Write a protein that binds this ligand. Structure first.
Ligand SMILES: Nc1ncnc2c1ncn2[C@@H]1O[C@H](COP(=O)(O)OP(=O)(O)OP(=O)(O)O)[C@@H](O)[C@H]1O
Ligand SMILES: Nc1ncnc2c1ncn2[C@@H]1O[C@H](COP(=O)(O)OP(=O)(O)O)[C@@H](O)[C@H]1O
Lengths: 481, 500, 53, 59, 179
């Protein structure tokens, strides 16, 4: 912020030690740019963050960029603030690194508003105590695994199932249905996958490239090519960009994180570099606090609400490992994405039974919604148990209640499909938004015997059960003709 | 031959115009275990090559408050404890040119085959940054690995980084070598990085390359297991720098890192010797950064930077199949897909012992030609049904006829995914093989006849019906005319093979 | 069998094709070094005149 | 390949000849430097390097 | 830093705050040889020897050598906190911090013969211009290990260097090896 000039004292990997004047040294969690020198013949600066005060006019930092080509005695500039990133509508439809610099080569972003990424959570008085239901407009998610406004949601689908199409549909739906915006934070983003995602966001209309700032998303990218300091703090950069849209603009923000396991992984890496003693399975000793200081700023204040949808990786496929076990202390709901359902064409490929939610309670969603969701779960579970018997006996050698159960279950399983606004670009179907009220009114009709004289391919890939009856009448006109 | 020495000594005595420059200097404090802590270089930068008094050259890695611990790219035997280290101000470059094709080199891009010297005029840094988001494209071009099981189930694209992960002695080097041999027709500059291998193993690999004729487009970077840890740490980066030169000059390349875990072990050794804080399995905190900085260099450029690409094919050895180990989890998180190998499948006859059900490819069908997808869908579905019904094989007698059909189709589709070492199928041959198998023009043969019949059929079609090869190659689709020609050739070879 | 005999023939050819050129080159470089020993004393002087002004 | 190998032996033999020639030349050069009058030789060359070191201070 | 650095800088700072820098330089060059000659260094070492039997003879050495009292206070504190085993390292590291505070960069000129001092003052001018040093205390050694001329190591210990006695023929060897 002033002439507080430091000099590098140690360079051991991406961890630096800086020496300072005897009275003026930065606080912990304070940015400092290293006025370094590239060997090619130009100057280039490196941003670091103070982690520890070491004694006689000496701190220890962690570089957000690489430390190759740095000498001892380079001028380190204290900045008096944490890492400051640009915020506001100027960060929309653009790609940012951990430092808030644009990396999409569209040009510069105007730092008219800069917030720090290190900030305390909202106060206990400023928190909202209401249990609202975030409505995504997707039938399966709204009915069987409801979302919470101000809560966190874990994506557990592997590679190849409809994950990216799902988050693009969530972005488009929070932009078109509510007045909300979205902030994608890529923790450990593979660079070619980052480019593919940015291209598909340009193409799906989410990132309006013909006119930026009409877009519905802000991209922050902490890549694998980057040191463990950047990959750890990129989630905080994304959360700050989302918290501006909550606080100042009073929107319903949607904060997408990539694998929150790589957040924990970068944290354990920086703790191993700083030399602290490892925790239980080798994680950082500040595991739960490092996770909570992030997850507690994803809340709902009196102004807006940030809802986070974090992809979760389970190492060695167990939920008792400390990174899944400490992530699951913050998840309010869970959607698993099915390889089998993606195969048989039930996009969105959300597993209906393995997706859970703590919002699905009578007190929160109404006794009607709870009872119909439980009845749908029972129907699908009975069909899953009965598939082997139908493979052996057949539908005829069953009983009548079991046969009507099987038919209603096939219709329900095909009704959990949906044509997406963002998947339309290769599928062609115009894409539908289905609120929760039409979802439960359609499932009441498909579950009680009011719509049983219909084909199974009439409920498939529609929304809004009136469209199912209309497509059924058209599929019957195909027969009359 | 008597005046050439006089002319060259006049030339080299007058070329140097008596230049003076300030140099950073330091004195050795303690040398041991390939590390030399040296006092004095207070202006050296991290990663910079420093030359010792006796001719050894080292890399300044950690710059402490008192001394500069350097790692030696050699044996520090003649270091003196008092000798003067002179910094050079350069950061680990290699000379690079198109004259490396047909050569084998070590981690300094110098010949070890003793066939002269590579006249290289340009230069490139060993640790050069990766292509950003805007200098990339989407991977669409196919990389033919010649193995039908990989090309149909786990397809590899140009610019993808695919992990050949497996156990010890399951066929990882065989898969990489089959790919490099298969790259003969396509103009792909292949690079093979032998990290910590036995020297006679690399000799066998390079003699196989020269015999098959794949040495004319290949460069072999070999740093055997007697090398210092710094050279085994630097070898994949020199490989990537050479392949990056060829990539940025609008060419398509392919680089194979043989046992990236060996590089991880070399880096662990030097990091522990530099008294750095260890982590899990005594690996340093930035071994993920090590592998990611290297693998992220494998890009498909952006069609304004030249459309060239570099396909990384790293190899990682698991121990007891413990994929939850530290380095395998790192490289799996970093790479695009994985190609798992199994000792159970390997000893059970199926070679190459690809585990298709657990191998992934995050690029997917975009890495195939239009001809391959049509047969690949049916092959994938039928192989999935066989994987489902594999438990019912002992009770195949007491089953439905459809189930027996799916079981027999599965156990004779498994027979066409077998291959012998160093015999890579072209894309037309594997298109015709997958088509025959997945339709069922070998549903009547016995299991000890499928491989022989397919060999005879492939040779017959390649010899007699070249319209099929031309329509599969020029149009890159499975045309109806190709279907008809293949059915005719199947019937003809079926008669000729029923003749026995 | 006959291409193994040709594989053996290659070795009989390589021994002569290398060792004769090798003997020529050895004796040539030896003659050239002992010939220059009368002249290197004079050829040292230009280096002296180069280093000292 | 084997002809390339012979050519490599050629070039390495050229190099070893140049090496031993220059070693004998360094012996002869220190020999002729032993005869020069050290006082005037230093008064000359140290001042030459003084001008060169001033140039170095500029660059 | 080090214990030597953190004690030497402390003594140089309490010598700057009450200007005695020449008196403390004379004091430390006296104490360097007073704590050389290993009987006395061993005696102030050898922790079996009591601190009172140390302090008595130490105050005697104070009275005889007529040292400044604050340097005597420094040695008393080195007896108090058991850092007297590093008194050699502290005293040898005092010179670098004294030259840092007093604006001097010390720069050897290792040449074969004695110089005529006009070009030596020229080297002094060059080393002081190129570093910003106010008054360089140039030193030389008569060392015939060189070939022709001179060379100067300046900077922190010897970090920077320009070499013209042998580096010419060294570059000639580097040309002839051609690798
Ligand atoms: N497709 C194949 N057909 C027949 N034999 C094969 C095949 N693939 C590998 N082999 C045989 O398996 C053995 C080991 O092969 P390879 O060296 O590729 O395995 P590896 O995993 O590289 O071994 P290591 O673990 O020692 O590195 C070799 O003898 C090779 O001949
Ligand atoms: N609602 C949908 N309708 C039609 N196709 C879909 C739908 N959702 C996903 N898909 C298809 O499934 C594939 C899923 O790929 P994607 O989710 O982008 O992979 P990843 O999860 O690795 O990003 C896409 O190629 C897409 O074409």
């Amino acid at each position: 912020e002033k002439k507080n000039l430091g000099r590098i004292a140690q360079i051991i990997g991406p961890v630096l030690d800086v020496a300072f004047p005897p009275g003026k040294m930065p606080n912990i969690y304070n940015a400092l740019i290293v006025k370094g020198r590239d060997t090619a013949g130009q100057p280039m600066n490196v941003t670091c963050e103070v982690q520890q005060l070491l004694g006689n006019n000496r701190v220890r930092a962690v570089a957000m960029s690489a430390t190759d080509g740095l000498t001892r005695g380079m001028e380190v500039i204290d900045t008096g603030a944490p890492l400051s990133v640009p915020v506001g509508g100027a960060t929309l439809g653009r790609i940012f690194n951990v430092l808030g610099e644009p990396v999409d080569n569209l040009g510069p972003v105007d730092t008219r508003t800069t917030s720090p990424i290190h900030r305390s959570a909202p106060a206990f008085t400023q928190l909202d105590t209401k249990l609202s239901i975030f409505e995504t407009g997707i039938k399966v998610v709204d009915l069987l695994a409801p979302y919470r406004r101000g809560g966190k949601i874990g994506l557990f689908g592997g590679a190849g199932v409809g994950k990216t199409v799902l988050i693009m549909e969530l972005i488009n739906n929070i932009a078109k249905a509510h007045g909300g915006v979205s902030v994608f934070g890529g923790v450990g983003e593979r660079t070619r996958e980052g480019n593919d995602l940015y291209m598909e966001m340009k193409e799906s209309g989410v990132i309006n490239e013909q006119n930026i700032a009409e877009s519905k998303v802000a991209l922050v990218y902490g890549q694998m090519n980057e040191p463990p300091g950047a990959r750890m703090r990129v989630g905080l950069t994304a959360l700050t960009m989302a918290e501006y849209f909550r606080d100042v603009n009073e929107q319903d923000v949607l904060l997408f994180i990539d694998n929150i396991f790589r957040f924990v992984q970068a944290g354990s890496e920086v703790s191993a570099l700083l030399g602290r003693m490892p925790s239980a399975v080798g994680y950082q000793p500040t595991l739960s606090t490092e996770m909570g200081s992030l997850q507690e700023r994803i809340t709902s204040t009196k102004e807006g609400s940030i809802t986070s949808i974090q992809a979760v990786y389970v190492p060695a496929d167990d939920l008792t490992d400390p990174a899944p076990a400490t992530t699951f202390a913050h998840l309010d709901a869970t959607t698993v994405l099915s390889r089998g359902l993606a195969a048989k064409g039930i996009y969105p490929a959300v597993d209906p039974l393995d997706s859970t939610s703590t919002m699905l309670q009578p007190r929160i969603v109404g006794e009607e919604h709870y009872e119909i969701a439980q009845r749908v779960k029972e129907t699908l579970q009975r069909y899953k148990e009965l598939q082997d018997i139908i493979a052996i006996l057949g539908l005829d050698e069953l009983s009548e209640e079991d046969r009507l159960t099987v038919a209603r279950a096939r219709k329900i399983e095909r009704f959990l499909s949906q044509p997406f606004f963002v998947a339309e670009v290769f599928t062609g179907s115009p894409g539908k938004y289905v609120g929760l009220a039409e979802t439960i009114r359609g499932f009441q009709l498909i579950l009680s015997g009011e719509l049983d004289s219909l084909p199974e391919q009439a409920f498939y890939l529609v929304g809004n059960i009136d469209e199912a009856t209309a497509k059924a009448m058209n599929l019957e006109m195909e027969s009359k003709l | 031959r008597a005046d050439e020495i006089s002319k060259i000594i006049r030339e080299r005595i007058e070329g140097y115009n008596r230049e003076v420059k300030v140099v950073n200097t330091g004195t050795v404090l303690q040398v041991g275990d390939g590390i030399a802590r040296i006092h004095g270089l207070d202006e050296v930068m991290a990663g910079e090559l420093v030359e010792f008094e006796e001719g050894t050259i080292g890399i300044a890695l950690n710059l402490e408050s008192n001394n500069v611990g350097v790692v030696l790219m050699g044996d520090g035997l003649m270091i003196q404890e008092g000798s003067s280290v002179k910094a050079t101000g350069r950061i680990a470059q290699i000379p690079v040119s198109e004259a490396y094709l047909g050569r084998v080199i070590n981690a300094l891009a110098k010949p070890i085959d003793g066939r002269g010297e590579i006249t290289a005029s340009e230069s490139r840094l060993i640790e050069s940054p990766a292509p950003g988001i805007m200098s990339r494209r989407s991977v669409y071009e196919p990389l033919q690995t010649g193995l039908i099981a990989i090309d149909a189930m786990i397809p590899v694209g140009r610019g993808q980084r695919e992990l050949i992960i497996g156990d010890r002695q399951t066929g990882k080097t065989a898969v990489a070598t089959d790919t490099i041999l298969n790259q003969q027709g396509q103009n792909v500059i292949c690079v093979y990085v032998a990290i910590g291998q036995k020297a006679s193993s690399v000799a066998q690999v390079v003699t196989n390359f020269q015999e098959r004729g794949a040495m004319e487009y290949t460069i072999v970077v070999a740093e055997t297991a007697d090398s210092p840890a710094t050279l085994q740490y630097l070898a994949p980066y020199t490989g990537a720098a050479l392949a990056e030169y060829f990539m940025y000059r609008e060419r398509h390349t392919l680089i194979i890192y043989d046992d990236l875990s060996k590089q991880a072990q070399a880096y662990r050794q030097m990091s522990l010797l530099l008294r750095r804080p260890p982590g899990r399995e005594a690996y340093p905190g930035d071994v993920f950064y090590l592998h990611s900085r290297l693998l992220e260099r494998a890009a498909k450029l952006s069609s304004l930077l030249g459309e060239g690409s570099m396909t990384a094919l790293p190899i990682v050895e698991t121990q007891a199949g413990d994929v939850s180990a530290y380095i395998p989890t790192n490289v799996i998180s970093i790479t695009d897909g994985q190609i798992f190998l199994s000792a159970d499948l390997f000893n059970a006859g199926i070679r190459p012992a690809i585990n298709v059900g657990i191998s992934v490819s995050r690029v997917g069908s975009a890495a195939q030609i239009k001809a391959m997808k049509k047969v690949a869908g049916k092959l994938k579905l039928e192989l999935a049904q066989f994987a489902e019904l594999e438990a019912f094989a002992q009770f195949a007698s007491d089953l439905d006829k459809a189930t027996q059909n799916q079981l027999a189709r599965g156990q004779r589709l498994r027979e066409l995914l077998k291959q012998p070492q160093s015999a890579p199928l072209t894309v037309e041959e594997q298109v015709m093989t997958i088509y025959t198998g997945t339709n069922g023009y070998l549903d009547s043969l016995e299991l000890d006849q499928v491989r022989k019949y397919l060999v005879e059929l492939r040779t017959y079609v390649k010899t007699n019906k070249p319209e099929f090869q031309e329509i599969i190659s020029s149009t890159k689709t499975f045309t109806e005319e190709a279907e008809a020609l293949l059915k005719e050739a199947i019937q003809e070879q079926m008669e000729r093979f029923l003749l026995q | 069998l006959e291409v193994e005999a040709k594989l053996a023939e290659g070795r009989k050819k390589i021994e002569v094709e290398l060792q004769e050129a090798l003997g020529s080159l050895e004796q040539q470089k030896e003659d050239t070094i002992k010939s220059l020993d009368s002249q290197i004393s004079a050829l040292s002087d230009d280096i002296v005149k180069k280093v000292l002004p | 390949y084997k002809n390339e190998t012979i050519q490599f032996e050629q070039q390495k033999a050229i190099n070893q000849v140049r090496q031993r020639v220059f070693q004998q030349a360094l012996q002869g050069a220190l020999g002729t430097l032993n005869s020069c009058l050290n006082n005037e030789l230093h008064l000359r060359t140290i001042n030459a390097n003084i001008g060169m070191f001033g140039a170095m201070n500029e660059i | 830093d080090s214990t030597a650095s953190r004690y030497a800088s402390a003594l140089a700072d309490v010598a700057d705050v009450t200007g005695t820098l020449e008196a403390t330089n004379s004091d430390v060059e006296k104490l360097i040889r007073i704590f050389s000659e290993e009987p006395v260094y061993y005696f102030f070492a050898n922790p079996v020897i009591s601190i009172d039997n140390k302090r008595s003879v130490l105050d005697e050495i104070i009275t005889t050598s007529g040292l400044q009292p604050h340097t005597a206070n420094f040695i008393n504190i080195l007896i108090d906190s058991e850092r007297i085993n590093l008194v050699k390292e502290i005293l040898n590291e005092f010179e670098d911090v004294f030259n840092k505070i007093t604006g001097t960069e010390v720069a050897v000129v290792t040449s074969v013969v004695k110089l005529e001092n006009d070009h030596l003052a020229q080297i002094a001018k060059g080393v002081q211009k190129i570093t910003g040093a106010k008054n360089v205390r140039i030193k030389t050694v008569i060392d015939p290990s060189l070939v022709a001329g001179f060379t100067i190591r300046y900077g922190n210990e010897g970090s920077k260097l320009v070499d013209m006695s042998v580096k010419k023929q060294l570059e000639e060897i580097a040309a002839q090896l051609e690798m």
